[PDB]
Amino acid sequence: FPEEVDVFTAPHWRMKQLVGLYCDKLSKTNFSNNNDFRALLQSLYATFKEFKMHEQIENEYIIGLLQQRSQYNVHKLSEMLSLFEKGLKNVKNEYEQLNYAKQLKERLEAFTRDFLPHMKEEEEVFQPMLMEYFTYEELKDIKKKVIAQHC
Prior knowledge:
The PDB classes it as gene regulation. By secondary structure, this protein is mostly helical. The protein has one domain: Four Helix Bundle (Hemerythrin (Met), subunit A) (Up-down Bundle). The chain is built from five helices and no strands. It has helices spanning 9-28, 34-70, 77-90, 94-133, 136-150.
């Protein structure tokens, strides 16, 4: 659709950038090294906080409106951030770091597997709906708001 009414593509470009970055970091991290371990968790925490802001912006500026006008599924992150905090606060040696690493990798993989199709659905399903329930200028205005909150 026209760029000026597209409320997902730019935010999702950033979220996908952040996904690729944590996938790269995770693959390069030495989980036996406490500094590498904690640097990874700190990066993940900042990333997932931005993911949380993203979903909240969608809720407050896009989905609430779209649901009112069109009139079921209720548009994870908090649990992930809690997992990271546990790593930063409760892991004190190599045994605990490597046991944590296994659980961390399983949860991030599951998360990533769910998050990419989540974004795709917004683009493929919600955006067409936005065209049907809102005027072109109403959508330009929503996009201005969504960008201002992301950037």
